[PDB]
Amino acid sequence: VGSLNCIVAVSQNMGIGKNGDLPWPPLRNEFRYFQRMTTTSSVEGKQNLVIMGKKTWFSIPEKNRPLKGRINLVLSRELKEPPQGAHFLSRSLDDALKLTEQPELANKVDMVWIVGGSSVYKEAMNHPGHLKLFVTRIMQDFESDTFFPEIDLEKYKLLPEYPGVLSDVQEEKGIKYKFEVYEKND
């Protein structure tokens, strides 16, 4: 198994969701960035693993589930088995990450990407060791009912460059946004 990473898009007021979807209208190139980051694996013969809560799973359009080219894992303590289309089910983040070490996955998984929601982002952000956050800053306020936890900048350093991530301001549908990469090690 390789690196541990979170990825999120967040408004200025720290919103990530409203009513089971995103706070903003569809930003097609932003979605494509999510796809490219989470799918792209530098290691031959491996895929990346995506870890998500149950509501996040059901917020992805059924036509796009499972996220293609990635191993899809859902966190739930109420489900008895993975939802239709998903590959794995875990009862805790610690369990999911230990599973990547088991014989069924140990040599299949390159990067791990945590794709939300709010509880798993908060727990991940405080997981030991080396972790990166790929954050899209949506530069407007949007009504939301689900929020991103606080990024502790004493530990998470905003990187001044990263290969493959555009540095300039993007704009779709009249909404400006920018890509950021943070890293901690503790």
**Residues making contact with ligand NDP (CB under 6 A):** 8-9, 16-17, 20-22, 52-56, 59, 75-79, 91-93, 115-120, 123, 146
SS3 content of the chain, % helix, strand, coil (to 5): 20, 35, 50
Whether the CB-CB separation of 132 and 2 falls below 8 Å is answered with no
Record the tokens describing residue 148, joined without a space: 């991103």
H or E element that contains 155: none
Record the tokens describing residue 128, joined without a space: 């030991």
Pairing of strands 47-53, 71-75: parallel
Residue 89 a catalytic site member = no
> Minimal distance in Å, beta carbon 131 to ligand NDP?
16
| Closer residue to ligand GHW (CB): 100 or 116 | 116
Record the tokens describing residue 169, joined without a space: 């301001």
Please state the three-class secondary structure of 72-94 as a single string. Answer: EEEECCCCCCCCCCCCEEECCHH
> Minimal distance in Å, beta carbon 62 to ligand NDP?
14
SS3 category, 98:
helix
39 marked as binding residue: no
Residue 75 a catalytic site member = no
Cα atoms in the 13 Å half-sphere on the side-chain side of 121? 22
74 marked as binding residue: no
| Closer residue to ligand GHW (CB): 89 or 120 | 120
Residue 1 touches which member of ligand NDP, ligand GHW, none, C-beta under 5-8 Å by kind: none
| Closer residue to ligand NDP (CB): 79 or 105 | 79
Binding segment for ligand GHW (CB under 6 A), chosen from 27-35, 72-80, 91-99, 102-110, is 27-35
Binding segment for ligand GHW (CB under 6 A), chosen from 61-69, 138-146, 151-159, 169-177, is 61-69
Q: For 29-52, b where at least 16 C-beta lie within 10 A, e where not — what string?
A: ebeebbeebbbebeeeebebbbbb
Footprint of ligand GHW (CB under 6 A) = 7-9, 22, 30-32, 34-35, 56, 60-61, 64, 67-68, 115-116, 136
Annotated binding site for NADP(+): 9, 15-21, 54-56, 76-78, 116-123
Residues that are catalytic:
22, 30
